[PDB]
Each structure stands twice: as C-alpha cells, then as structure tokens.
Amino acid sequence: GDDRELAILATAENLLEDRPLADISVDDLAKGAGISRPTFYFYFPSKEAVLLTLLDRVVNQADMALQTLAENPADTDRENMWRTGINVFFETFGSHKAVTRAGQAARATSVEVAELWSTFMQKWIAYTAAVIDAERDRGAAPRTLPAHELATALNLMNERTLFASFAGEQPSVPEARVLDTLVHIWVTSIYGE
Amino acid sequence: GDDRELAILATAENLLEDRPLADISVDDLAKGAGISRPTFYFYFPSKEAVLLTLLDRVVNQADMALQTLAENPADTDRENMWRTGINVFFETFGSHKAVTRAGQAARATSVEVAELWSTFMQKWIAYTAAVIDAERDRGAAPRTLPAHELATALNLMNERTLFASFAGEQPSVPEARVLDTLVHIWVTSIYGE
Numbered sequence: 001g002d003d004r005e006l007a008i009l010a011t012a013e014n015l016l017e018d019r020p021l022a023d024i025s026v027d028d029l030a031k032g033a034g035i036s037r038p039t040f041y042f043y044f045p046s047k048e049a050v051l052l053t054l055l056d057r058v059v060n061q062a063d064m065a066l067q068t069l070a071e072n073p074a075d076t077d078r079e080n081m082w083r084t085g086i087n088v089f090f091e092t093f094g095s096h097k098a099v100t101r102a103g104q105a106a107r108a109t110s111v112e113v114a115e116l117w118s119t120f121m122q123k124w125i126a127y128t129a130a131v132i133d134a135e136r137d138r139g140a141a142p143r144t145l146p147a148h149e150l151a152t153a154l155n156l157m158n159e160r161t162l163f164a165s166f167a168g169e170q171p172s173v174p175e176a177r178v179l180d181t182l183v184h185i186w187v188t189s190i191y192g193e
Numbered sequence: 194g195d196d197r198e199l200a201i202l203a204t205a206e207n208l209l210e211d212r213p214l215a216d217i218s219v220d221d222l223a224k225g226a227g228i229s230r231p232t233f234y235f236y237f238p239s240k241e242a243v244l245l246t247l248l249d250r251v252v253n254q255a256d257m258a259l260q261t262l263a264e265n266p267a268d269t270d271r272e273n274m275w276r277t278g279i280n281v282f283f284e285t286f287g288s289h290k291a292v293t294r295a296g297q298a299a300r301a302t303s304v305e306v307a308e309l310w311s312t313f314m315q316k317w318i319a320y321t322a323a324v325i326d327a328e329r330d331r332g333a334a335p336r337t338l339p340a341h342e343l344a345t346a347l348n349l350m351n352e353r354t355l356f357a358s359f360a361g362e363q364p365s366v367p368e369a370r371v372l373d374t375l376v377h378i379w380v381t382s383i384y385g386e
C-alpha cells in the first residue's frame with residue numbers, strides 16, 4: 001500500500017548514499033522497491049518528487065525535535081541550552097547525510113525544494129530570535145544587534161558549516177569539532193559586548 | 194585580439210545580470226561580442242568556460258585587494274581592522290553579483306569552479322587564522338577555539354550570508370545591514386571568552 005511508498009523512499013535514501021540523484025533511475029527505484037515502473041508512477045510523479053518527500057520528512061523530524069526541546073527546558077546554563085538546540089540539527093541532518101546533500105543541491109533546480117528549505121529556515125530563525133529576545137528581556141543578553149538579523153546570520157552559518165562538515169568539503173570544520181565550533185560563535189555573539 | 198576575449202567576458206557578465214547561464218547561448222555571447230560562433234570557439238571551449246574565467250577574475254580581484262590591505266595596516270582598533278577586511282569581500286563580490294550568483298550555482302556541476310572556490314577559501318581561512326593567532330600571541334585575543342577551525346566557520350558564515358544577502362534570498366540579512374552583522378559575530382567570537 002503506502003508500504004510500497006515507504007519502500008520507494010527507503011530505496012531512494014539507500015541509493016543516494018552511493019550516487020547522486022542524476023545517476024539514479026526510476027527503474028533503479030522501482031527495482032529496489034520491488035515494484036514495476038508504472039506502479040512507481042502511481043506513488044510519485046518523478047524521482048525529484050521522491051527526494052522532495054525525503055527532505056520533507058528530515059526537515060519535519062528536525063522541527064519536531066526542536067519543538068520538544070522548546071516545550072521541555074533542559075535545566076542548564078546558557079551554553080548547554082544553545083548546544084542542546086544546535087545538536088538537534090547536527091544529529092537529525094547528520095543521520096541523513098545523503099538526503100541532506102541531495103536536497104541541498106536540489107535547491108538550484110527545484111522551486112519546491114527551495115521553498116521547503118526557505119519555510120523552515122524562516123521558522124528556525126524566528127525561534128532563535130524569540131529566544132535571544134527573551135534572553136535580553138531577562139537581562140541575560142545585551143541589546144547589541146537586531147535579534148532577527150543576528151539570528152539570520154547564525155542560522156546561515158550553521159547551515160553552511162554543518163553541511164560542509166557532513167560532505168567533508170575542502171575546506172570544512174571536522175565533523176567531530178563542528179558542534180563546539182558553532183556553539184562558541186553562538187554564545188559569544190549572543191552574550192558578548 | 195584579446196579585445197574580443199574581453200568583449201565575450203563583458204557580454205556574458207551583462208547577460209548573466211538578466212538570466213541564468215542555462216538561458217544564455219553561445220550565439221547570444223558571440224552576437225553581443227560582435228563575432229561569429231566559430232570565432233567564439235577559438236577563445237573559449239564553452240559558455241561554462243566563460244563563467245569560470247569571470248569567476249577567476251572576481252576571486253583574484255578580491256584576493257589582490259586583501260593582499261593590499263595585509264601589506265598596509267589601517268591605523269585602527271580591532272573592530273575596524275576586521276570590518277575593513279570583510280568589506281573587501283562585501284564590495285568585490287557585491288560589485289559582481291551576477292558572476293557571484295552564477296559561479297556559486299556552477300559549483301554543483303563544474304569541478305573546475307568547485308576547485309577554484311575551494312583554493313581561495315583555503316587561502317582566506319589560512320590568512321584569517323594567521324591574524325587570529327597573531328592577535329592571541331600579542332595578548333589581544335584569548336586562546337579559545339583552535340584558530341583554524343574558528344576561521345573556517347567564520348569564513349563559511351560570510352560566504353553563505355553575503356551571497357544570500359546579494360541574491361535577496363528568503364531568508365537573508367538586508368544588504369545594508371550585513372556588514373555590521375558579520376563584523377559583530379567576528380569580533381565577539383574572536384575576542385570573547
């Protein structure tokens with residue numbers, strides 16, 4: 001049923017680990033999923049549409065994990081507060097590196113993928129800015145830059161730096177160092193004057 | 194002569210302001226440059242090769258401007274030191290937004306463009322790290338993160354945030370606010386404990 005759907009998705013995520021979407025075929029996806037090519041087309045219009053769904057699931061998984069954290073304060077200092085939050089993104093995207101990688105590239109060619117990234121980025125930035133503002137209101141953070149602008153740059157840093165690290169780009173921060181690196185820059189830029 | 198070359202380059206940069214490289218033709222470039230299509234192919238193997246050269250020129254212009262700054266210290270505090278430096282990139286790339294935009298997209302499809310970006314990014318990060326280290330050695334900056342790792346994240350932030358701003362992506366820092374935004378995060382993360 002939608003078991004077939006789940007299978008198409010699992011096959012695509014598995015195949016994306018080995019090669020880019022350009023070198024994966026609908027025949028490849030159908031085969032791996034144990035269905036014919038016409039049956040594939042019943043569930044998805046295109047292999048592009050498969051990636052879109054995989055990216056949607058990863059993005060929503062991150063978002064739901066962040067919502068959980070936001071509802072349950074971990075009983076910490078400001079550094080571990082931000083760390084735990086950044087770590088949601090580090091772990092979620094880091095657990096799905098092939099979807100992350102293919103979904104990042106697809107931004108250039110797919111308006112739907114571009115808009116999905118854009119929608120969630122705006123949400124995560126707004127949440128970052130709300131937290132910074134609450135930190136300023138409680139007297140914990142100084143009123144320096146506009147919170148939303150600061151939040152924008154810090155989120156864009158995270159996007160670029162996490163994904164470079166996961167892809168092993170040259171240059172990149174080693175994956176085992178990237179959390180500490182980002183948390184330092186967040187805590188210093190948010191609390192520093 | 195290489196006047197024709199310069200003309201091909203000017204035409205391409207002009208046309209990239211209006212549409213992506215995919216919708217610009219060799220006939221478009223030849224026409225604008227006042228030459229035939231075979232004459233074009235004498236000077237460049239492909240329209241992809243034209244972009245590569247345009248990107249090479251912009252990247253080297255930034256690099257040369259940074260070398261000039263590095264040879265002549267501006268007589269300032271630490272904040273204006275970093276600002277003047279970031280401003281080299283803000284002004285150089287900001288003066289060539291269409292090449293910036295097309296060259297960023299071309300990373301995904303062109304190994305030569307990927308390697309060009311990568312070579313200069315490594316140079317600029319190494320220079321950033323050298324400056325941070327000299328700041329630490331003089332007792333002006335605390336020994337926090339590994340300088341090279343800090344330098345990596347800050348450069349990757351700048352890349353992503355400048356180029357989002359220039360493209361007017363949603364989300365992005367307004368172009369008129371991006372310099373102040375980046376300088377704050379650099380100065381706080383470099384000098385802060």
Ligand SMILES: CC1CCN(C(=O)NC2CCCCC2)CC1
Nearest residue numbers: 085086089124128155158159162
């Ligand atoms: C796809 C991006 C989205 C933003 N990212 C990220 O680490 N920011 C978090 C930090 C903790 C509070 C919410 C936002 C990087 C990955």
Ligand SMILES: CC1CCN(C(=O)NC2CCCCC2)CC1
Nearest residue numbers: 278279282317321348351352355
């Ligand atoms: C293409 C990138 C390269 C790096 N960028 C940049 O602003 N960094 C500068 C800051 C001043 C010292 C040298 C490095 C962003 C644009």
